[PDB]
Nucleic acid binder design. Structure first.
Ligand SMILES: [Zn+2]
Ligand SMILES: [Zn+2]
Length: 95
DNA sequence: GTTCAAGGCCAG
DNA sequence: CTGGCCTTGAAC
């Protein structure tokens, strides 16, 4: 399937839904360090595989827009296991 | 024992 | 900063 954010190849469920590996890394990086970006355009830049790197601000807005969850990023940076969205993913897979 | 989604590593 | 690959571990 295609990443709902940039269209790249999905690698699995990441923070609420299927996304590509790069967007998973980007969202993690962003939320973990409270990164704050600023768009030089009009905060409505188009995101695609070849432009996602051009504006992190709009890339992040899209991540939130499509449904990526801030709560899936762990405050205590705990490793492994499975979060509260475990069952949800199991349901999304079936349907 | 196996899954597999979340965190970590690091070459570029 | 980016993103492909690695490590971790509760849930099943
Ligand atoms: Zn993506
Ligand atoms: Zn923008």
């Amino acid at each position: 399937e295609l990443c709902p954010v940039c269209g790249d190849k999905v690698s699995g469920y990441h923070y609420g839904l299927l996304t590509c590996e790069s967007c998973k890394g980007f969202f993690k990086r962003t939320v973990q360090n409270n990164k704050r970006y600023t768009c030089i355009e009009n905060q409505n830049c188009q995101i695609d595989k070849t432009q996602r790197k051009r504006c992190p601000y709009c890339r992040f807005q899209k991540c939130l827009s499509v449904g990526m969850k801030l709560e899936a990023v762990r405050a205590d940076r705990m490793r492994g296991g499975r979060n509260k969205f475990g069952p949800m993913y199991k349901r999304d897979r079936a349907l």
